[PDB]
Design a protein around this ligand. Sequence first.
Ligand SMILES: [Cl-]
Ligand SMILES: [Cl-]
Ligand SMILES: [Cl-]
Length: 163
Amino acid sequence: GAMAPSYRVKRMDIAKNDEECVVNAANPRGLPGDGVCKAVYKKWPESFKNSATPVGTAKTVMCGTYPVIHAVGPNFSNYTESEGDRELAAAYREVAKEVTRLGVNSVAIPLLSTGVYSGGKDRLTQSLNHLFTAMDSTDADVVIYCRDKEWEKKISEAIQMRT
Ligand SMILES: [Cl-]
Ligand SMILES: [Cl-]
Ligand SMILES: [Cl-]
């Protein structure tokens, strides 16, 4: 565990993280994909051996000894708001189980279903709150990765409001 488990946010490519493991915003078929998934494929391609897993689940594959946790958020183009919300909460619960099983002291995590899978909605708060629900009972240092300057501000404010 971390000595004083924390949440932080950084605005940069998750493929350059300084944590003991990474969460990929995966597709269910283990394909290279686009966005976070493509950056993860270029950095850790060995981790996409048998990485396919259903929506709402997480599957870990090692790249050397570095764990890549493939977490499959729902595509809100295809799911109802209700079913999508349930699957997005479930993907994060499975990430917390994997982070715990691996025994890491830190994890780099993107906001699931906030990009191409958002169904053209702003899901910062919805996705971040499901991340907190899952990860609050873990003792890993969590570092959230984003790319947008105003998202960095909003994520940082949400973290600091609980401290
Ligand atoms: Cl960067
Ligand atoms: Cl996404
Ligand atoms: Cl972002």
